[PDB]
Structure formats: structure tokens, C-alpha cells
Design an enzyme around this catalytic site. Structure first.
Site, PDB file in Angstrom:
ATOM      1  N   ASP A 248      98.261 -34.630  56.222  1.00 27.89           N
ATOM      2  CA  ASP A 248      99.887 -35.330  56.005  1.00 27.89           C
ATOM      3  C   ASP A 248     100.780 -35.707  56.908  1.00 27.89           C
ATOM      4  O   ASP A 248     101.338 -34.812  57.694  1.00 27.89           O
ATOM      5  CB  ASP A 248     100.588 -34.209  55.242  1.00 27.89           C
ATOM      6  CG  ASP A 248     101.780 -34.904  54.399  1.00 27.89           C
ATOM      7  OD1 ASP A 248     102.827 -33.936  54.116  1.00 27.89           O
ATOM      8  OD2 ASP A 248     101.938 -36.222  54.293  1.00 27.89           O
TER       9      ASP A 248
ATOM     10  N   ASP B 107     103.197 -42.410  56.130  1.00 33.57           N
ATOM     11  CA  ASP B 107     102.847 -41.216  55.391  1.00 33.57           C
ATOM     12  C   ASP B 107     101.523 -41.274  54.678  1.00 33.57           C
ATOM     13  O   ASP B 107     101.239 -41.714  53.626  1.00 33.57           O
ATOM     14  CB  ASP B 107     103.903 -41.205  54.376  1.00 33.57           C
ATOM     15  CG  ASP B 107     103.877 -39.787  53.622  1.00 33.57           C
ATOM     16  OD1 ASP B 107     103.099 -38.916  53.846  1.00 33.57           O
ATOM     17  OD2 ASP B 107     104.754 -39.377  52.719  1.00 33.57           O
TER      18      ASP B 107
HETATM   19  C1  LIG Z   1     103.410 -37.197  47.331  1.00 35.00           C
HETATM   20  C2  LIG Z   1     104.064 -36.065  47.964  1.00 35.00           C
HETATM   21  O1  LIG Z   1     104.838 -35.312  47.827  1.00 35.00           O
HETATM   22  N1  LIG Z   1     103.380 -35.995  49.250  1.00 35.00           N
HETATM   23  C3  LIG Z   1     103.665 -35.064  50.286  1.00 35.00           C
HETATM   24  C4  LIG Z   1     102.306 -34.543  50.621  1.00 35.00           C
HETATM   25  C5  LIG Z   1     101.851 -33.946  49.482  1.00 35.00           C
HETATM   26  C6  LIG Z   1     100.593 -34.226  48.990  1.00 35.00           C
HETATM   27  C7  LIG Z   1      99.900 -33.799  47.697  1.00 35.00           C
HETATM   28  F1  LIG Z   1      98.797 -34.109  47.523  1.00 35.00           F
HETATM   29  C8  LIG Z   1     100.647 -32.900  46.912  1.00 35.00           C
HETATM   30  C9  LIG Z   1     102.154 -32.562  47.319  1.00 35.00           C
HETATM   31  F2  LIG Z   1     102.688 -31.763  46.587  1.00 35.00           F
HETATM   32  C10 LIG Z   1     102.535 -33.034  48.531  1.00 35.00           C
HETATM   33  C11 LIG Z   1     104.474 -36.011  51.579  1.00 35.00           C
HETATM   34  O2  LIG Z   1     104.594 -34.935  52.560  1.00 35.00           O
HETATM   35  C12 LIG Z   1     105.346 -36.762  51.181  1.00 35.00           C
HETATM   36  N2  LIG Z   1     106.375 -37.155  52.341  1.00 35.00           N
HETATM   37  C13 LIG Z   1     107.594 -37.678  52.048  1.00 35.00           C
HETATM   38  C14 LIG Z   1     108.552 -36.260  51.689  1.00 35.00           C
HETATM   39  C15 LIG Z   1     109.257 -36.292  50.611  1.00 35.00           C
HETATM   40  C16 LIG Z   1     109.867 -35.040  50.354  1.00 35.00           C
HETATM   41  C17 LIG Z   1     109.982 -33.809  51.299  1.00 35.00           C
HETATM   42  C18 LIG Z   1     109.321 -34.024  52.560  1.00 35.00           C
HETATM   43  C19 LIG Z   1     109.576 -32.881  53.615  1.00 35.00           C
HETATM   44  C20 LIG Z   1     108.177 -32.272  53.248  1.00 35.00           C
HETATM   45  C21 LIG Z   1     109.371 -33.664  55.086  1.00 35.00           C
HETATM   46  C22 LIG Z   1     110.752 -32.141  53.474  1.00 35.00           C
HETATM   47  C23 LIG Z   1     108.733 -35.295  52.540  1.00 35.00           C
HETATM   48  C24 LIG Z   1     107.931 -38.842  50.863  1.00 35.00           C
HETATM   49  C25 LIG Z   1     109.127 -39.334  51.035  1.00 35.00           C
HETATM   50  C26 LIG Z   1     109.598 -40.154  52.305  1.00 35.00           C
HETATM   51  C27 LIG Z   1     109.501 -38.857  53.360  1.00 35.00           C
HETATM   52  C28 LIG Z   1     108.126 -38.052  53.337  1.00 35.00           C
END
Ligand SMILES: CC(=O)N[C@@H](Cc1cc(F)cc(F)c1)[C@H](O)CNC1(c2cccc(C(C)(C)C)c2)CCCCC1
Length: 379
Positions: A35, A227
Site C-alpha cells: 500500500d 495509491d
Molecule cells: C480502499 C482503502 O481504504 N485503501 C487503503 C488500504 C486498504 C486496502 C484494503 F484492501 C483494505 C483496507 F481496509 C485498506 C489505502 O490506504 C487508502 N489510502 C487513502 C487513505 C484513506 C483514508 C485514510 C488513510 C490513512 C491510512 C493515511 C490515514 C489513507 C485513500 C484516499 C486518499 C488518501 C489515501
């Protein structure tokens, strides 16, 4: 770089890409989602119905309790855990071992996915967005600090190419270098605007050669990031609406339900009859290393129409209220270099890109755009 790191990623369509890692002594094998949209290294460390295995700290002689709580909320999934350090390796990565911070997941909601085959997540972004705060050194920083591995990594995410099962996907995470056999043509670099997310600047957008003609601040309204942990291309409200309007018009010969355009409902055709030629190509022009220059990455419908179970596709472009998120579907078919050392992200056509008879995914430049630093969101 290394031939042994090729094809070290696996996944199921829509459920991210994961790399095999080991934690503890003796080594405990876990599959970890790669990620670039987060900065915490975390692993299931307690029973959950969707986990078939998990990190058992008691079984590790090299484990060390940091006596500190930690919590991360993502787009909709979330987890709570306990910090600690342990020895970590990537069997199909560099031949080194490092003591990294590890968030041991004890509670979670809508984080683990049923049948995904991953048990943890590897946040490859910077310390600034790490939880609880920026003092928790991310994994990649520990790797570069403790070893001689160059401060750079690259990702070649490949598409699907069955039946009642989600399509299997594969790819490569090359740590510490650039593998020239994973791409063709030239590598074009866009600056990392700021070291927190992998933030970039989009200066122009075209759908089938037609400029959206929006004030470029709109394309980065909030922020634009790369991302690997988000599946879709997510676009700010105004851009999303303009984009779907144009994609609808180009493919007007056929009609699909509103559910399709909203990313939830699927749309199918008989096997092999998918009319790829009616859907337009999308070009995102990213700011170049040189002021007044840009380059474009062109995306085919084979990338933004994601295949699903039982020929069925979902529209993999959706609305955002947190900026442009260049997710996995945009990264697929490109070789993407996260050149942290030189604060820039490179793009090149991937060796596993979607050919297609007439059109192809491309990376091309330069294109001269007057003013680009004015496309950003000034804190
Ligand atoms: C779909 C999703 O949530 N993907 C995440 C990983 C993931 C994968 C998966 F298969 C299951 C999950 F539960 C999580 C990414 O990290 C998302 N990344 C952003 C984000 C969203 C909300 C807080 C955050 C953090 C972790 C930085 C606080 C970062 C997205 C918007 C723009 C900013 C980056």
C-alpha cells in the site's frame, strides 16, 4: 533490482496486491498488501473469521513490546492494535532482514476481506501520515536506514489477463532499483510534491483526445496521489461528473443502467464480444520535472472496466471528496518507480500492458503547459 523479485506480487481483482513476508524468529509467513497510500506496517495478530493465520508474538524470540496502542482508519476499513518491533524479511525481495515497527492487529472492522489471501498491510508512504504520529518510522525508512538498499522501489502491477472466482492478478515489487525488462520506451518523471502521501500534480485531462478544459486546480482539488491500496481511479466531484458525461457520450451507441456508472452494478456481454472500441481512452498529463513541461499517461477501457465474477465488468472510476486517487487500475499496464531518493515518481509503459488491436496504454512527452505550480492546493 533483481530477477528473483519478478512476479513477487499476487492478488484477487479488486482486493489489492500482496507480497509474502516473514515476521519473528522463527519466521512466521504472512501475505501483506502493498500500500503506497498509507505508512503503517500492520498484521493480524489475533483470530478473525477471514484470517486463516496470524502473527503470534509469543512464538517469536526477537519480539519486543513497545507498550503503546495504535489505530488506523482507512476509507472504510479500520483496525486497532499494539505496537512492537520484530525482525522482518521479504523472501522474494532484497536478501536482508530488518527490525521494523509492527502494529499487531487485535480488533478490526471491514478491514480484512473474505478470501483475499492477505493477513496484513505494508504502508510504503512517508512518516508524516503514520499513526499514531510521525515518530513511528515506517517499514521502508527502517529498511534503508538499517541496510544498504537504495531509497527507491518500483511496482509493476499487472491486470487479470476464473468463472465464479475473482480473477487472479500478479505483478512485481522491485525494491532498491529499476528493472529495465519490466518496461519499454522512456521513463517520464513527475515530482513528489510533498513527502506524506505520494502526492503529484495533474495539469490536464483528456477523454479521447478532448480536453476537459477545467482549471487545473480542480484536478488536484484537495490533492492527487498514487495509491496502490485503492482499486479505482477516484476523481474529485466536478472532474468525475465531467469524465462520466464524456465516457457516456463516446459509448452512446449502447445504453447501460445508472448503477453501472455509479461503480456498484455490473454490466456484461457475451464472451469475447466486449465492445472495447466504443469506450474512450483517458489521458492524465502529469507535471514534468521541468517547469512548463508535462507528460501524459493514457489509460484504456481495458484498465477502467474491471472484470468480476460470472464477461462481466464494473466501472472502476468513482467519485472522491479527498482528491484524485490514482489507484491500481491506473497503475496497471505501467511500470511505476517511486524514486524517494530524488523525490519523483516515474512512469513507463509496462511489459504486461493491455495491447489491444488499435490502441495501447502509453507514456508520452513532453507537452508544454504554461504554469503548473498553480495547479496545486496551497495548504
Ligand atoms: C480502499 C482503502 O481504504 N485503501 C487503503 C488500504 C486498504 C486496502 C484494503 F484492501 C483494505 C483496507 F481496509 C485498506 C489505502 O490506504 C487508502 N489510502 C487513502 C487513505 C484513506 C483514508 C485514510 C488513510 C490513512 C491510512 C493515511 C490515514 C489513507 C485513500 C484516499 C486518499 C488518501 C489515501
Amino acid at each position: 533490482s533483481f530477477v528473483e523479485m519478478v512476479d513477487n506480487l499476487r492478488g484477487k481483482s479488486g482486493q489489492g496486491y500482496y507480497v509474502e513476508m516473514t515476521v519473528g524468529s522463527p519466521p512466521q509467513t504472512l501475505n501483506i498488501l502493498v500500500d503506497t497510500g498509507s505508512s503503517n506496517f500492520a498484521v493480524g495478530a489475533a483470530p478473525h473469521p477471514f484470517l486463516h493465520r496470524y502473527y503470534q508474538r509469543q512464538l517469536s524470540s526477537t519480539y519486543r513490546d513497545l507498550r503503546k496502542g495504535v489505530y488506523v482508519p482507512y476509507t472504510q476499513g479500520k483496525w486497532e492494535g499494539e505496537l512492537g518491533t520484530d525482525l522482518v524479511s521479504i523472501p522474494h525481495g532484497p536478501n536482508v532482514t530488518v527490525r521494523a515497527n509492527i502494529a499487531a492487529i487485535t480488533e478490526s472492522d471491514k478491514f480484512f476481506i473474505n478470501g483475499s489471501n492477505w493477513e496484513g498491510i505494508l504502508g510504503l508512504a512517508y512518516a508524516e501520515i503514520a499513526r499514531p504520529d510521525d515518530s513511528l518510522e515506517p517499514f521502508f525508512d527502517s529498511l534503508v536506514k538499517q541496510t544498504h538498499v537504495p531509497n527507491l522501489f518500483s511496482l509493476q502491477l499487472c491486470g487479470a489477463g476464473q468463472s465464479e472466482v475473482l480473477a487472479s492478478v500478479g505483478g512485481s515489487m522491485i525494491i532498491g532499483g529499476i528493472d529495465h525488462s519490466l518496461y519499454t520506451g522512456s521513463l517520464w518523471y513527475t515530482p513528489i510534491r510533498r513527502e506524506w502521501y505520494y502526492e503529484v500534480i495533474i495539469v490536464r485531462v483528456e477523454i479521447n483526445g478532448q480536453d476537459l478544459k477545467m482549471d487545473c486546480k480542480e484536478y488536484n482539488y484537495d490533492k492527487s496521489i498514487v495509491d496502490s491500496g485503492t482499486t479505482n481511479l477516484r476523481l474529485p466531484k466536478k472532474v468525475f461528473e465531467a469524465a462520466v458525461k464524456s465516457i457516456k457520450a463516446a459509448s452512446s451507441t449502447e445504453k447501460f443502467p445508472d448503477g453501472f456508472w455509479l461503480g456498484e452494478q455490473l454490466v456484461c456481454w457475451q464472451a469475447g464480444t466486449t465492445p472495447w472500441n466504443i469506450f474512450p481512452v483517458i489521458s492524465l498529463y502529469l507535471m514534468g520535472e521541468v517547469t512548463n513541461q508535462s507528460f501524459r499517461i493514457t489509460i484504456l477501457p481495458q484498465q477502467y472496466l474491471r472484470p468480476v465474477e460470472d464477461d462481466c465488468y464494473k466501472f472502476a472510476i468513482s467519485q472522491s471528496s479527498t482528491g484524485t486517487v490514482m489507484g491500481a487500475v491506473i497503475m496497471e499496464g505501467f511500470y511505476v518507480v517511486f524514486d524517494r531518493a530524488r523525490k519523483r515518481i516515474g512512469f513507463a509503459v509496462s511489459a504486461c500492458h493491455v495491447h489491444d488491436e488499435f490502441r495501447t496504454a502509453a507514456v508520452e512527452g513532453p507537452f508544454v503547459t504554461l504554469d503548473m505550480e498553480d495547479c496545486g492546493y496551497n495548504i
